[PDB]
Amino acid sequence: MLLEAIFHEAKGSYAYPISETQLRVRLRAKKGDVVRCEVLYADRYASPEEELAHALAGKAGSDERFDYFEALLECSTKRVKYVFLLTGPQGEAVYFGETGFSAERSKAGVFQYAYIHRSEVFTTPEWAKEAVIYQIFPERFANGDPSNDPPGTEQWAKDARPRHDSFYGGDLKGVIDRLPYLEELGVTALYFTPIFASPSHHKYDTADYLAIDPQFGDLPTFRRLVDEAHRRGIKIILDAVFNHAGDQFFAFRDVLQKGEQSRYKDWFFIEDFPVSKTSRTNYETFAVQVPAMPKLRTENPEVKEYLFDVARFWMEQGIDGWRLDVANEVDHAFWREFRRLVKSLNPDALIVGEIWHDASGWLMGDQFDSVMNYLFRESVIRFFATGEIHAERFDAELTRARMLYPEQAAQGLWNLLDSHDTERFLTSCGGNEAKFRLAVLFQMTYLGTPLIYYGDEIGMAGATNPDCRRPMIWEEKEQNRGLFEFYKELIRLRHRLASLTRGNVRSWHADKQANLYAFVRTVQDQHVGVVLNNRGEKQTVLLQVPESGGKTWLDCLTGEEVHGKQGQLKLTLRPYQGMILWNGR
Amino acid sequence: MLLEAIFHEAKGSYAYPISETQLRVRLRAKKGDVVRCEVLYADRYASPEEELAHALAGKAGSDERFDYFEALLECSTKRVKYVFLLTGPQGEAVYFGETGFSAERSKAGVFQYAYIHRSEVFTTPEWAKEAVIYQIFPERFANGDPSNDPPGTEQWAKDARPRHDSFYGGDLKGVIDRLPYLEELGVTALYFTPIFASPSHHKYDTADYLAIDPQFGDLPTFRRLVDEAHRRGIKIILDAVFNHAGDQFFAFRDVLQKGEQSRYKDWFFIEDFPVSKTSRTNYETFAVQVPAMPKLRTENPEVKEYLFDVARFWMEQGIDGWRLDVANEVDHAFWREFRRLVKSLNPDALIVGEIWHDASGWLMGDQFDSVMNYLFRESVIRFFATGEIHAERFDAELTRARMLYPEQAAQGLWNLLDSHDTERFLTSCGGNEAKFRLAVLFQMTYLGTPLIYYGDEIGMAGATNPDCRRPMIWEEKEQNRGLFEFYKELIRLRHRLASLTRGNVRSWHADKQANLYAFVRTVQDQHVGVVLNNRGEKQTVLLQVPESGGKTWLDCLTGEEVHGKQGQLKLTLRPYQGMILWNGR
Ligand SMILES: [Ca+2]
Ligand SMILES: [Ca+2]
């Protein structure tokens, strides 16, 4: 075998505890290069003569070029040393240890996970493990209070097409009035984009972190919203913009006024005074040359303390978690301490980051609970919407992403289809509802946290920002109720099937020709197989199914009862049809 | 090329800053697969159609199976995205990014290092960068005060062969009385094994963390040592045993007496009560079944606070750093807060850990400054002492270890030859001084921090514990002055040639047949080539030397001047001779 392609490290996503006495370990090798992977381990202090314990590492999946093997080590002592025994296709075996590879175990050396502290077991909120989150763009969800509308608010109609500076009067009172709707849909949490006081239309340039923007509401109204959503089993998540503040931020206006005499000058990154200019700026900002968005020096104990007080203030209002913005530009110490603060105030408070690249450095257990799964969106777009990739590629991309972080993070990843900054998924599907639905069926049954973008559940369409920010369609006759019921049904199933929320995922079938993909979610003895026929054709397929997993399944969507004969399940799907097979366990 | 063998990650030891605006990046590939490696990068927010900056990554080294390439990216914005352009032996051009590999730059995507925070730039003490540590085993270094000598103390002679429980009376007073000796040698720091009050001989079972053990001295004496050492340019490093306390530790004593009613019961890991019994332990301890060494619950904020106070106490006494014992069994948060505390009280205080496996998790810059380089010792023993490995294997071992951590850590790793727990290195060489000297020559000119084990510089020998803990030989007649002068000479050169302390490392020559190995240390325009003839035979070697780095060199050990002709240098080395060639720059 090709040893230079084999990999493992005793940390990060390849070695991490799931409990105080259990260490999950993962190893990758060139695809098809390793047939069997066994882990020989023992307590780090075991005598050089004691027998080692064996752990067969099953193949958790494979992507474009790699095979992923996964094992679980039982370490009652909370300390462990281990070596891998790898067997190739033609029987050649080799031990893989910290020292390297060798036919002899001793020369291979041994990896070591020094100690498993309970405080370092990646732990996330139970409710978030089976949540369905709904993204609200407040300005356009519901206008419950016309008296707070910005000057020049345009009419709220379906035939409306938002402009970069449009206004429709969306506010918090509206969200309250429409909570019955959200409860009926079945969402377990609402995620709001910035709603703190800001002079701009987007609100990403914060003026007052301790106040709701007047056009959206005020503290009393926000408290009501929190309480009304809670009694309806709906949690509240706010968007925290701690990387940078607005130019109206009290601290920044002070610097603009007193210059180098300001007591808050070190709360920012200023090259030279005075602080301003035309098309020019002498201080670090969000992105490049964005005057209204001066970057905050979070490394400053004073800045950190202030933002932490902001965090305390809103959590005291009863919110259930945070969605960080440009989190990757704030230092790690801030995030480690942020988690400590947040969790000490509310163990169930969720911390979600938004990072457009490998976020492993933030998903170890000491910082964020999860991040936006942009990888999930890209794979769903190219597979169900544009058709740029086929079932096998789809499978590879999905698997590769899955092996990116520890299972506690991957299990809570926010799986979005679109957002206020992208075209609506329906439009990506060119208006084809059959493709749109197949994608939602996948989203609702895949590993991670489903995130619904307001309006998608009733079939709203739209081009990217700002056309994706149209006023929510509330007229029932104008809503796609067929779709609405589809979402509600998928949501109900997800809550009733433990494997869809707390189960693992394994690819079941992948056919590039028929463009059909199937996977299985598993929890204990329960198995739920999802088969997706992503073709505008009636296709038939043969799936492998050993009696151990059962011989009878039930399609939770149609009630049909399928039967496997001789370890095979014959299925015939309609164009863009998806089946959700439950093994009755 | 084997694409599944190529590696890089935008963090850890493969992507890290060396300053606020410079990012060091490393890429691993199967040896020989890549002949040229370039990096195309830009600010993360740069426009697509914007021209990318170029950075050539030279081959930093190779080990048994891989080539390691290294480049330096200039990032004025402190934000960078990048993709590698790898060229193979046949001229194939493949791009490598976060997405994967592709013949097209766009399809390979880019890695991203979100933001470089100055507080995240790995920083170590300046004095530690060019230090020479001397390990002192107090009981055997010098008996300065017989009044504190424990009962049964033996004689202090060369022919004294220590027993497991022998005594000689070494103490702090003795250290002070011998400071002139240590100053002459040229050591800049003293590393002491545990010396806090303990009822055992070894003192690893701390009874009182706030007191010097009576057999070694008292606080007034310790202070005197700190001051007298300091005015001698000698710093003091203490052994911190924070993973576990002794059974005499006040908190544990209270638990043994008040059991379940004990106020400090949660300061330890107790299975059941009563907290103890005959020959049996019901609480977690160091290693396995060591009743005298109860494990401390450093996760308990109260335990952390106490241990932090302990650190404050000794730092107020003027010490310059800590050598942590069993540090990998203490939680990470503890070490991060420890560093924060230690650096706040004294930015120049050093923190060294001891971990017998990949310590990358503690060497990111937020925890330890460095760790003992056990790999260095293993490589020097097999190459210089036992001859189990030849020059090429030796080269590979060094390179592999060198690429384990970021440069800031690698530069300060303690490169020891032996310790109180191993046989004397001279003994490892079977008494062959010629081999012993070549290893020392190497130790004194290689990357890292040289650590002298008391007595090695005067020719002391001995088998492992306790024969390696023999009474220090103080009779000049009994001391190997020739060797002493050799050490002193090497130490002077190290302090005068900046490249030997702050320069990088590049293998220069490695021949498995001649068993000759050479490397070059480089800083600014200065180049110091170290040539090692590790064979009992006069040999000649032709080394490659492009005129760019100079054409004339001076052997700093003999005064001999060598000249290169047409890019080549002909050197004739005597049996086990090492040369230290300075390029006059
Ligand atoms: Ca309104
Ligand atoms: Ca004494």
Short mmCIF file of C-alpha atoms in Angstrom, two decimals, chain B residues 181-563:
data_model
loop_
_atom_site.label_atom_id
_atom_site.label_comp_id
_atom_site.label_asym_id
_atom_site.label_seq_id
_atom_site.Cartn_x
_atom_site.Cartn_y
_atom_site.Cartn_z
CA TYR B 181 32.40 27.16 38.21
CA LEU B 182 29.08 27.46 36.38
CA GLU B 183 29.86 31.01 35.27
CA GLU B 184 33.21 29.92 33.82
CA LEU B 185 31.50 27.15 31.87
CA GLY B 186 29.32 29.81 30.28
CA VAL B 187 25.86 28.47 31.17
CA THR B 188 23.08 31.09 31.18
CA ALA B 189 20.46 29.11 33.11
CA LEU B 190 20.08 26.48 35.78
CA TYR B 191 17.32 23.90 35.67
CA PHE B 192 16.52 22.30 39.04
CA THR B 193 14.49 19.13 39.51
CA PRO B 194 11.91 19.32 42.32
CA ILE B 195 13.19 20.86 45.55
CA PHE B 196 9.97 21.70 47.40
CA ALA B 197 9.34 20.05 50.79
CA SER B 198 8.59 16.35 50.43
CA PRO B 199 9.04 13.31 52.73
CA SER B 200 10.48 11.14 49.95
CA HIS B 201 13.97 11.13 48.44
CA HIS B 202 12.84 12.12 44.95
CA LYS B 203 10.49 14.92 46.05
CA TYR B 204 7.95 14.41 43.25
CA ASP B 205 5.28 13.98 45.91
CA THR B 206 5.04 17.58 47.11
CA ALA B 207 4.15 18.03 50.79
CA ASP B 208 4.46 21.82 50.75
CA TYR B 209 4.55 23.77 47.47
CA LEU B 210 5.49 26.95 49.32
CA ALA B 211 8.65 25.71 51.03
CA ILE B 212 12.15 24.61 50.06
CA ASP B 213 12.84 21.11 51.41
CA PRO B 214 14.91 21.32 54.64
CA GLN B 215 17.60 18.99 53.32
CA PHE B 216 18.22 21.45 50.45
CA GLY B 217 17.88 24.74 52.29
CA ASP B 218 15.40 27.48 53.13
CA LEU B 219 13.87 30.59 51.52
CA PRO B 220 16.69 32.97 52.53
CA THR B 221 19.20 30.62 50.93
CA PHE B 222 17.08 30.21 47.80
CA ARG B 223 16.87 34.01 47.43
CA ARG B 224 20.63 34.30 47.81
CA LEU B 225 21.04 31.75 45.00
CA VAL B 226 18.63 33.68 42.76
CA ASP B 227 20.56 36.94 43.23
CA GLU B 228 24.09 35.51 43.06
CA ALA B 229 23.16 33.49 40.00
CA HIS B 230 21.60 36.55 38.34
CA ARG B 231 24.57 38.86 38.80
CA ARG B 232 26.44 36.01 37.13
CA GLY B 233 24.13 36.08 34.12
CA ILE B 234 22.62 32.80 35.26
CA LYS B 235 18.83 32.38 35.45
CA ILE B 236 16.91 29.87 37.58
CA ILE B 237 14.26 27.40 36.35
CA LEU B 238 12.18 25.34 38.80
CA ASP B 239 10.36 22.05 38.27
CA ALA B 240 6.60 22.51 38.62
CA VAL B 241 4.76 19.32 39.53
CA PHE B 242 1.19 20.54 39.20
CA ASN B 243 -0.36 17.36 37.81
CA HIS B 244 -0.33 15.71 41.23
CA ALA B 245 0.52 16.50 44.86
CA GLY B 246 1.98 14.32 47.58
CA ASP B 247 -0.10 12.51 50.19
CA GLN B 248 1.39 14.99 52.70
CA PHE B 249 -0.14 17.93 50.81
CA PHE B 250 -2.27 19.83 53.32
CA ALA B 251 -5.42 19.57 51.18
CA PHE B 252 -5.02 15.83 50.78
CA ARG B 253 -4.21 15.36 54.47
CA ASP B 254 -7.48 17.14 55.28
CA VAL B 255 -9.28 14.73 52.93
CA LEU B 256 -7.62 11.71 54.54
CA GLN B 257 -8.77 12.96 57.94
CA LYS B 258 -12.20 14.50 57.27
CA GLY B 259 -12.99 12.25 54.33
CA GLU B 260 -16.46 12.90 52.94
CA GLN B 261 -16.67 15.93 55.23
CA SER B 262 -13.42 17.34 53.82
CA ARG B 263 -13.62 20.81 52.32
CA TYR B 264 -11.03 19.85 49.71
CA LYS B 265 -12.60 16.56 48.59
CA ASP B 266 -13.25 17.95 45.09
CA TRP B 267 -9.59 18.97 44.80
CA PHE B 268 -8.83 15.38 43.90
CA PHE B 269 -10.30 12.40 42.01
CA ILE B 270 -11.82 10.19 44.73
CA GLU B 271 -13.67 7.01 43.77
CA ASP B 272 -15.19 6.20 47.18
CA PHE B 273 -14.78 6.89 50.91
CA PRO B 274 -13.01 6.35 53.23
CA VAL B 275 -10.38 8.06 51.08
CA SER B 276 -7.88 5.22 51.55
CA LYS B 277 -6.74 1.87 52.94
CA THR B 278 -3.78 -0.53 53.24
CA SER B 279 -1.81 -1.11 50.02
CA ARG B 280 -4.89 -0.05 48.05
CA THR B 281 -5.92 3.25 46.50
CA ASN B 282 -9.42 4.54 45.86
CA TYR B 283 -8.32 7.81 44.26
CA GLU B 284 -6.63 8.70 40.99
CA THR B 285 -2.87 9.08 41.24
CA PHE B 286 0.23 9.53 39.12
CA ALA B 287 0.69 6.51 36.83
CA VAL B 288 -0.83 3.36 38.35
CA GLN B 289 -1.44 2.68 42.04
CA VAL B 290 0.87 5.31 43.55
CA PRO B 291 -0.87 6.25 46.85
CA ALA B 292 1.76 8.88 47.64
CA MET B 293 0.94 10.85 44.48
CA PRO B 294 -2.79 11.82 44.37
CA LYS B 295 -3.84 13.46 41.09
CA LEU B 296 -4.92 17.10 41.45
CA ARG B 297 -8.15 18.29 39.80
CA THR B 298 -6.68 21.29 37.98
CA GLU B 299 -10.10 21.76 36.33
CA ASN B 300 -11.42 22.78 39.74
CA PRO B 301 -11.11 26.59 39.84
CA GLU B 302 -10.02 26.36 43.48
CA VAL B 303 -7.17 24.00 42.64
CA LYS B 304 -6.15 26.19 39.73
CA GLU B 305 -6.16 29.30 41.93
CA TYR B 306 -3.99 27.66 44.56
CA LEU B 307 -1.43 26.39 42.05
CA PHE B 308 -1.40 29.84 40.41
CA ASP B 309 -0.66 31.35 43.82
CA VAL B 310 2.19 28.89 44.14
CA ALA B 311 3.58 30.19 40.83
CA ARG B 312 3.17 33.80 41.99
CA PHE B 313 5.06 33.06 45.19
CA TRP B 314 8.12 31.66 43.49
CA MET B 315 8.09 34.24 40.72
CA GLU B 316 8.13 36.98 43.35
CA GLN B 317 11.30 35.23 44.51
CA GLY B 318 12.89 36.10 41.16
CA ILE B 319 12.91 32.75 39.32
CA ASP B 320 13.00 32.90 35.52
CA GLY B 321 10.87 30.00 34.32
CA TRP B 322 9.20 26.64 34.85
CA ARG B 323 9.82 23.06 33.75
CA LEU B 324 6.43 21.31 33.90
CA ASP B 325 6.23 17.66 34.86
CA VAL B 326 3.52 15.41 33.38
CA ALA B 327 2.01 18.52 31.77
CA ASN B 328 0.04 16.58 29.17
CA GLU B 329 -2.24 15.27 31.94
CA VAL B 330 -3.35 18.76 33.03
CA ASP B 331 -6.15 20.44 31.03
CA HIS B 332 -5.30 22.93 28.25
CA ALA B 333 -7.34 25.80 29.68
CA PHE B 334 -5.15 25.54 32.77
CA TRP B 335 -1.96 25.93 30.76
CA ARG B 336 -3.38 28.84 28.73
CA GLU B 337 -4.33 30.73 31.86
CA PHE B 338 -1.01 29.73 33.36
CA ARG B 339 0.94 31.27 30.49
CA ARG B 340 -1.23 34.36 30.71
CA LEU B 341 -0.42 34.65 34.44
CA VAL B 342 3.27 33.87 34.04
CA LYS B 343 3.77 36.27 31.11
CA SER B 344 1.86 39.07 32.84
CA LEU B 345 4.11 38.87 35.90
CA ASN B 346 7.27 38.45 33.80
CA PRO B 347 7.21 38.44 29.96
CA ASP B 348 10.67 36.86 29.99
CA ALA B 349 9.66 33.90 32.19
CA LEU B 350 10.14 30.60 30.32
CA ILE B 351 7.67 27.69 30.30
CA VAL B 352 8.98 24.26 29.29
CA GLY B 353 6.88 21.12 29.15
CA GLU B 354 7.80 17.44 29.17
CA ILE B 355 5.77 15.26 26.82
CA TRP B 356 6.93 12.01 25.28
CA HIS B 357 4.86 12.38 22.11
CA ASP B 358 3.83 14.97 19.52
CA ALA B 359 3.33 18.10 21.66
CA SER B 360 1.87 20.24 18.88
CA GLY B 361 -1.27 20.74 20.97
CA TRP B 362 0.78 22.64 23.57
CA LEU B 363 3.11 24.39 21.11
CA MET B 364 0.84 26.82 19.26
CA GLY B 365 1.96 29.85 21.25
CA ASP B 366 -0.85 30.07 23.80
CA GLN B 367 0.57 27.49 26.23
CA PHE B 368 4.23 26.34 26.50
CA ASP B 369 7.30 28.00 25.00
CA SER B 370 8.89 24.63 24.34
CA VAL B 371 9.32 21.04 25.50
CA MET B 372 12.15 18.57 26.07
CA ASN B 373 13.38 17.35 22.67
CA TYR B 374 13.35 13.61 23.40
CA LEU B 375 13.53 12.96 19.65
CA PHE B 376 16.80 14.84 19.56
CA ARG B 377 18.27 12.57 22.24
CA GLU B 378 17.03 9.40 20.53
CA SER B 379 18.56 10.50 17.25
CA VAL B 380 21.94 11.44 18.76
CA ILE B 381 22.17 8.19 20.72
CA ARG B 382 21.57 5.96 17.70
CA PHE B 383 23.81 8.00 15.43
CA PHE B 384 26.72 8.90 17.70
CA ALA B 385 26.62 6.34 20.50
CA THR B 386 25.25 2.99 19.33
CA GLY B 387 25.65 3.45 15.61
CA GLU B 388 22.24 1.89 14.98
CA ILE B 389 21.56 4.49 12.26
CA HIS B 390 23.65 6.13 9.55
CA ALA B 391 23.90 9.74 8.38
CA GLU B 392 20.90 9.61 6.00
CA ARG B 393 18.54 8.10 8.59
CA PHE B 394 19.90 10.62 11.10
CA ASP B 395 19.14 13.44 8.66
CA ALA B 396 15.58 12.17 8.12
CA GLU B 397 14.86 11.88 11.87
CA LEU B 398 16.08 15.41 12.51
CA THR B 399 14.07 16.89 9.63
CA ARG B 400 10.86 15.09 10.62
CA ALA B 401 11.12 16.29 14.22
CA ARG B 402 12.00 19.82 13.03
CA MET B 403 8.75 20.04 11.02
CA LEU B 404 6.57 18.94 13.92
CA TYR B 405 6.02 22.42 15.36
CA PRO B 406 6.10 26.11 14.38
CA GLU B 407 9.62 27.55 14.19
CA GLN B 408 9.29 29.56 17.41
CA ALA B 409 8.95 26.33 19.42
CA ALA B 410 11.49 24.31 17.45
CA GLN B 411 14.07 27.05 18.02
CA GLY B 412 13.80 26.67 21.81
CA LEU B 413 13.40 22.93 22.36
CA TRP B 414 15.65 21.57 25.09
CA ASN B 415 18.19 19.34 23.32
CA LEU B 416 19.38 16.96 26.02
CA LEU B 417 21.78 14.05 25.72
CA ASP B 418 20.79 12.40 28.98
CA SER B 419 19.15 12.99 32.36
CA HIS B 420 18.85 11.78 35.94
CA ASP B 421 16.54 9.10 34.56
CA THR B 422 18.89 7.76 31.86
CA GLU B 423 22.44 6.43 31.59
CA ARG B 424 25.19 9.02 31.13
CA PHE B 425 25.74 9.81 27.45
CA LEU B 426 29.44 9.01 27.81
CA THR B 427 28.35 5.58 29.02
CA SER B 428 26.05 5.32 25.99
CA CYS B 429 29.14 5.86 23.81
CA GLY B 430 30.83 3.01 25.66
CA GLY B 431 33.37 5.43 27.07
CA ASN B 432 34.52 6.60 23.63
CA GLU B 433 35.27 10.29 24.17
CA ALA B 434 35.76 10.92 20.44
CA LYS B 435 32.12 9.95 19.84
CA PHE B 436 31.01 11.85 22.92
CA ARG B 437 32.66 15.03 21.63
CA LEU B 438 31.15 14.83 18.14
CA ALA B 439 27.70 14.52 19.71
CA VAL B 440 28.42 17.54 21.93
CA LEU B 441 29.78 19.47 18.98
CA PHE B 442 26.46 18.70 17.25
CA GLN B 443 24.40 19.55 20.33
CA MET B 444 26.15 22.90 20.62
CA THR B 445 25.59 23.87 16.98
CA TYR B 446 22.12 22.48 16.17
CA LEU B 447 18.66 24.13 16.32
CA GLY B 448 17.27 24.29 19.84
CA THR B 449 18.45 24.89 23.37
CA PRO B 450 21.46 22.83 24.56
CA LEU B 451 20.94 21.24 27.99
CA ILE B 452 23.94 20.02 29.97
CA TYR B 453 23.38 17.27 32.55
CA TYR B 454 25.51 18.08 35.62
CA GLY B 455 28.96 16.50 35.38
CA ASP B 456 28.82 15.58 31.69
CA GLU B 457 31.16 18.51 30.94
CA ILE B 458 33.92 17.04 33.14
CA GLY B 459 33.71 13.51 31.77
CA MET B 460 31.47 11.83 34.35
CA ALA B 461 30.13 8.43 33.41
CA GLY B 462 27.59 6.00 34.78
CA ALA B 463 24.68 3.69 34.02
CA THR B 464 21.06 4.83 34.39
CA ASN B 465 19.37 5.87 37.67
CA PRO B 466 20.89 5.77 40.18
CA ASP B 467 24.36 5.36 38.71
CA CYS B 468 23.84 8.56 36.69
CA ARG B 469 23.23 10.49 39.92
CA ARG B 470 26.74 10.14 41.32
CA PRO B 471 28.39 12.82 43.50
CA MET B 472 29.65 15.59 41.23
CA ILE B 473 33.41 15.32 40.72
CA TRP B 474 34.99 18.54 42.05
CA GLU B 475 38.67 17.56 42.31
CA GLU B 476 40.29 19.23 39.29
CA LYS B 477 42.60 16.23 39.12
CA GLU B 478 39.60 13.90 38.69
CA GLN B 479 37.85 16.19 36.20
CA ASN B 480 38.37 15.82 32.44
CA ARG B 481 39.57 19.42 31.98
CA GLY B 482 40.25 18.74 28.32
CA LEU B 483 36.54 18.11 27.85
CA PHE B 484 35.62 21.05 30.10
CA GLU B 485 37.62 23.36 27.83
CA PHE B 486 35.93 21.78 24.83
CA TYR B 487 32.47 22.58 26.20
CA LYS B 488 33.54 26.12 27.11
CA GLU B 489 34.90 26.68 23.61
CA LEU B 490 31.68 25.48 21.98
CA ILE B 491 29.61 27.67 24.29
CA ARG B 492 31.65 30.78 23.40
CA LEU B 493 31.25 30.14 19.65
CA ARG B 494 27.51 29.62 20.03
CA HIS B 495 27.17 33.02 21.72
CA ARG B 496 29.25 34.75 19.05
CA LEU B 497 27.75 33.17 15.92
CA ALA B 498 24.16 34.49 15.76
CA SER B 499 23.26 31.77 13.25
CA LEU B 500 23.91 29.08 15.84
CA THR B 501 21.19 30.48 18.09
CA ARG B 502 18.74 32.31 15.80
CA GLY B 503 19.46 30.73 12.42
CA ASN B 504 17.42 28.20 10.45
CA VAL B 505 18.55 24.64 9.66
CA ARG B 506 19.20 23.10 6.22
CA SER B 507 20.79 19.73 5.56
CA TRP B 508 24.00 20.25 3.63
CA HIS B 509 25.29 16.74 3.07
CA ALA B 510 24.33 13.20 4.05
CA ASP B 511 26.14 10.09 2.87
CA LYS B 512 25.09 6.69 4.24
CA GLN B 513 28.32 5.10 3.02
CA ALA B 514 30.77 7.58 4.55
CA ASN B 515 28.35 8.22 7.44
CA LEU B 516 29.18 11.88 7.12
CA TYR B 517 26.48 14.49 7.81
CA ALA B 518 26.56 18.25 7.46
CA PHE B 519 24.11 21.10 7.84
CA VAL B 520 24.12 24.86 7.51
CA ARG B 521 22.77 27.33 10.05
CA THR B 522 21.74 30.63 8.44
CA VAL B 523 20.81 34.11 9.68
CA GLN B 524 20.85 37.30 7.58
CA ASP B 525 23.88 36.81 5.35
CA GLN B 526 25.76 34.70 7.88
CA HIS B 527 26.28 31.01 7.14
CA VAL B 528 27.82 28.50 9.50
CA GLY B 529 28.38 25.07 8.02
CA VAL B 530 28.77 22.22 10.48
CA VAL B 531 30.47 19.10 9.07
CA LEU B 532 30.39 15.87 11.04
CA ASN B 533 32.65 12.95 10.22
CA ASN B 534 30.94 10.33 12.34
CA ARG B 535 33.32 7.51 11.44
CA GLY B 536 36.61 6.21 12.85
CA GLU B 537 38.47 7.00 9.62
CA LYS B 538 40.16 10.00 8.00
CA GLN B 539 37.85 10.92 5.10
CA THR B 540 37.63 13.51 2.37
CA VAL B 541 34.36 15.03 1.20
CA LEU B 542 33.44 17.26 -1.72
CA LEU B 543 30.62 19.60 -0.67
CA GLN B 544 28.54 21.77 -2.98
CA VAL B 545 28.86 25.49 -2.32
CA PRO B 546 27.43 28.05 -4.77
CA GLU B 547 29.40 31.32 -4.81
CA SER B 548 26.28 33.15 -3.62
CA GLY B 549 26.94 32.14 -0.02
CA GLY B 550 30.67 32.78 -0.10
CA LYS B 551 33.86 31.13 -1.40
CA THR B 552 35.99 31.19 1.72
CA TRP B 553 35.37 29.68 5.16
CA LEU B 554 37.09 29.60 8.55
CA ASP B 555 36.99 26.52 10.78
CA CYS B 556 36.26 28.23 14.10
CA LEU B 557 37.67 25.28 16.03
CA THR B 558 41.16 25.13 14.48
CA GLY B 559 41.69 28.43 12.71
CA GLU B 560 42.05 26.60 9.37
CA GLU B 561 40.88 28.50 6.31
CA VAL B 562 39.25 26.52 3.52
CA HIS B 563 38.49 27.70 0.00
#
